[PDB]
C-alpha cells in the first residue's frame, strides 16, 4: 500500500506538471481582444408564487415556457412562465425534495431527495392526470441532482458519493459512476449527452463518459464543497460554484482551471450556476440572498439579481436564452430578463 | 380558447394548493437527530406505539407533528442538514452516559456545529440527555471517573437551581447537570434570542418525552410570535 501511495503522489505531481506545461497564458491575457459587457441590469419580469417552503430546485422546459419547480413542502409545481399559470401541482410522497428535472420531450418530470428515490411522473397520460410513472431506488444517499437524457434514460447524482444512469423503462441502473470522495451535489449533461460533469463535496469535479462509465478527467482547485456545476454551451468546458465563495471555469480539453470568479466582499458559497445562451454570462446564486451575473471571460461581476429574501437555491436558463428563473428559500421563483 | 382552459386549470390548482397550504401550516416538522447508541430509535418506537428518511406522524392536543429520522444517509451531515432549517425544532439526542473513546465529546461537537450553523441559527434545538438512568448507575458504581475525560468536572459544583429527583444521589445530579451545562455553554454562547436550546433529562422509555417536545414547540412558536412583535 505504501508503494501505491508513493506512485499516486508521483502521478499527482506529474499531472500537476503537465497541467502547468499546458498553461502558458492566463484567460485574462488571452481575452484582451474582447470588450467587457458592462452592467447587466435584469429585472424580475415574473414572480411565481404558490410554493410554501424553500424551493430547492427548478428545471426549464425545452419550449422555454413550461418549467418544473420543487419545494420542500412536497410540491412539484409545473408553471407556464408566460402567464404565471400553474399547469400542474404534483404532491410528492417525500417532502424533502432537493432536485427536479423536466423531460426534454416535456411528457415527464423527475424529482428526488432525502428519500434516495428518483420519482418520474407522467405529464401526458391517457386520462390527462399525473401519476408516478416510476420510482428509481438504489442510491444509498440523498438524491442531489437528476437530469433526463430522454424519455427512457435518466442520470442522477447522490450523497452516496456516486452517480447513476437509469433505464426508466425497466427501472434498473444502466451504469454506475464512482470516484468522488464526497456527496455529489450536482451534475450537468453535455450538449451531446455523451459525457457529464459532476461536482462533489470533495472539492473536486469529475467528467464521466456515459457509455464507458469511467471517470475521464478530474478537476481540482476549489477549496471547499462544490455545490453547483454546469457545462459551457459549447460542450468543451464547464463551471463550478463552491462553498469557498468562488466560482471557477474549467475546460475539458486542457484538464485545468481557466478562470476564477471571486471577490473580497463575497464570503458566502455558491448554490447554483447557469450559463447564458452564448456562455458570455455566468449566473451564480449565492448564500447572501443575491445572484451574481459574472462576465465569464473577464471574470468581473457584470450584474446583480437582487430581490430574493432568502438563499438563492436554484438557477435555470431557457434553451433559447430569453429568461432566467431563480428559485430561493423564500418560496418564490423569479423570472428575469 | 386555450387561455381560458389554462386559467380554469390554474384556478383548480389554486384551490387545492390553498387546502394544502392550510394542511402544511397546521403541521409542525421536527428533525430527530442523534447517535446510533443515543436511544433515538427507542424514542421513535415509544412515540410510534403511543428508506432515506423515516417519517413519524403524531398528534398532541389535536396538534399535528411530523418528525423525521435520518436513516440511510452518510455521517457527513453538512449538506443534508440544511434541509431542516425551517423545522419547528431539532431534537438532538445525547447518550449522557457515554462520557469512540468519548462519545459525549462527539455529541458536544455535533451540537456546537448545529448551533453555529448559519442555516440552523434560527432553528431551536431540543436537547434530550437520553441516558440519565445509565449515567446514574455508572456514577453510582464508581467506575465513571469522569474527571479524567473532563477535568473541569473536578472543580465543578452542582448549581443552586438544580432540582434533583426524589431519592437521587448528589453525585448523579452533579454529573448530569455538569453535562447539561457543558451543552449550555455552547448554547448560550451567541444565542442572541433567535434560537433556543431546551435541555431535558430524559430516558429512552420516558412517555414524558412527547409532552416535552410539544411544550418546547409551543414555547418556540410563542417566542417566534413575540419576536414578530419585537417583544423578544
Amino acid at each position, epitope marked *: 500500500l505504501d508503494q501505491l501511495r508513493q506512485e499516486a503522489e508521483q502521478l499527482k505531481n506529474q499531472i500537476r506538471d503537465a497541467r502547468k506545461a499546458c498553461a502558458d497564458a492566463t484567460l485574462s491575457q488571452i481575452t484582451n481582444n474582447i470588450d467587457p459587457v458592462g452592467r447587466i441590469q435584469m429585472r424580475t419580469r415574473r414572480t411565481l408564487r404558490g410554493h410554501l417552503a424553500k424551493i430547492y430546485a427548478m428545471h426549464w422546459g425545452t419550449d422555454s415556457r413550461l418549467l418544473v419547480s420543487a419545494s420542500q413542502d412536497g410540491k412539484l409545481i409545473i408553471w407556464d412562465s408566460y402567464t404565471t399559470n400553474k399547469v400542474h401541482a404534483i404532491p410528492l410522497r417525500s417532502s424533502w425534495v432537493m432536485t427536479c428535472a423536466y423531460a426534454p420531450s416535456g411528457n415527464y418530470v423527475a424529482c428526488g431527495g432525502l428519500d434516495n428515490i428518483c420519482s418520474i411522473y407522467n405529464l401526458k397520460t391517457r386520462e390527462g392526470n399525473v401519476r408516478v410513472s416510476r420510482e428509481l431506488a438504489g442510491h444509498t444517499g440523498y438524491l442531489s441532482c437528476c437530469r433526463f437524457l430522454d424519455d427512457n434514460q435518466i442520470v442522477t447524482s447522490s450523497g452516496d458519493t456516486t452517480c447513476a444512469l437509469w433505464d426508466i423503462e425497466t427501472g434498473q441502473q444502466t451504469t454506475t459512476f464512482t470516484g468522488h470522495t*464526497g456527496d455529489v451535489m450536482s451534475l450537468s449533461l453535455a450538449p451531446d449527452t455523451r459525457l457529464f460533469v459532476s461536482g462533489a463535496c470533495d472539492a473536486s469535479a469529475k467528467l464521466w463518459d456515459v457509455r464507458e462509465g469511467m471517470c475521464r478527467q478530474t478537476f481540482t482547485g476549489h477549496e471547499s464543497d462544490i455545490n453547483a456545476i454546469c457545462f459551457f454551451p459549447n460542450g468543451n468546458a464547464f463551471a463550478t460554484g463552491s462553498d469557498d465563495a468562488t466560482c471557477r471555469l474549467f475546460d475539458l480539453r486542457a484538464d485545468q482551471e481557466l478562470m476564477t470568479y471571486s471577490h473580497d466582499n463575497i464570503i458566502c458559497g455558491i448554490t447554483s450556476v447557469s450559463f447564458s445562451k452564448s456562455g458570455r454570462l455566468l449566473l451564480a446564486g449565492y448564500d447572501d440572498f443575491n445572484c451574481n451575473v459574472w462576465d465569464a471571460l473577464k471574470a468581473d461581476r457584470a450584474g446583480v439579481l437582487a430581490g430574493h429574501d432568502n438563499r438563492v437555491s436554484c438557477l435555470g436558463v431557457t434553451d433559447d436564452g430569453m429568461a432566467v428563473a431563480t428559485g430561493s428559500w423564500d418560496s418564490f421563483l423569479k423570472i428575469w430578463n | 380558447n386555450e387561455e381560458k382552459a389554462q386559467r380554469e386549470a390554474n384556478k383548480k390548482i389554486e384551490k387545492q394548493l390553498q387546502k394544502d397550504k392550510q394542511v402544511y401550516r397546521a403541521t409542525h416538522r421536527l428533525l430527530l437527530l442523534g447517535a446510533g447508541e443515543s436511544g433515538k430509535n427507542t424514542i421513535v418506537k415509544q412515540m410510534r406505539i403511543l428508506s432515506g428518511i423515516f417519517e413519524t406522524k403524531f398528534q398532541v392536543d389535536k396538534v399535528n407533528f411530523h418528525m423525521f429520522d435520518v436513516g440511510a444517509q452518510r*455521517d457527513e451531515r*453538512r449538506k443534508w442538514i440544511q434541509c431542516f432549517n425551517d423545522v419547528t425544532a431539532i431534537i438532538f439526542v445525547v447518550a449522557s452516559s457515554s462520557y469512540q*473513546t468519548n462519545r459525549l465529546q462527539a455529541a458536544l461537537k455535533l451540537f456546537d456545529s448545529i448551533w453555529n450553523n448559519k442555516w440552523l441559527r434560527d432553528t431551536s434545538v431540543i436537547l434530550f440527555l437520553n441516558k440519565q438512568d445509565l449515567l446514574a448507575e455508572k456514577v453510582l458504581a464508581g467506575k465513571s471517573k469522569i474527571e479524567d*475525560y473532563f477535568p473541569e468536572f473536578a472543580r465543578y459544583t452542582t448549581p443552586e437551581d438544580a432540582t434533583p429527583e426524589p431519592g437521587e444521589d448528589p453525585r448523579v445530579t452533579r454529573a448530569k447537570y455538569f453535562i447539561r451545562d457543558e451543552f449550555l455553554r455552547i448554547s448560550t454562547a451567541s444565542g442572541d434570542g433567535r434560537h433556543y436550546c431546551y435541555p431535558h433529562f430524559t430516558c429512552a422509555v420516558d412517555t414524558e418525552n412527547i409532552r416535552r417536545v410539544f411544550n418546547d414547540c409551543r414555547d418556540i412558536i410563542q417566542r417566534m410570535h413575540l419576536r414578530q412583535y419585537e417583544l423578544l
Partner: nanobody
Amino acid sequence: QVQLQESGGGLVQPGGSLRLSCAASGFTFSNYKMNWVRQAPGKGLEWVSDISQSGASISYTGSVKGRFTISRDNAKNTLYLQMNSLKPEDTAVYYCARCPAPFTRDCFDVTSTTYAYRGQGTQVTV
C-alpha cells in the same frame, strides 16, 4: 487539491514530548478553523483539539487538557500540536483535519469516516 500532510509522529516513552506538524496546501490556511483528531487502534475517530482561524479561540478534548497545545502559523500555512505528559492511550494515528467551509463557526464532519479535507495522519506510539 486540498492537501494536509502530518509529520513528527514517532516512538516516545510515557510522559515524553513530541511536536506534530501539519503542512497545509491548496487553500487559504488563515480562512479555515483547524482540528486535530486521532484514531486509536480498535476505536473510531476521536476529536482532540480545534483552533480558530486566527488562533484566538482554542478548544481541547478533556483527556489532553493541560498536556497538549494546539497552535497555528498562518504565515507558514502550518499547524502544530505540542505533546507533553504523554500516556500510552495517546498512541494513535493523528489526522490534521480542516473544517469544511471558510468563515464559518460550524465544523461539521471532521471526524467522519470518509472526510475529504483530512490528512493521512501520522503514527504516535507511546
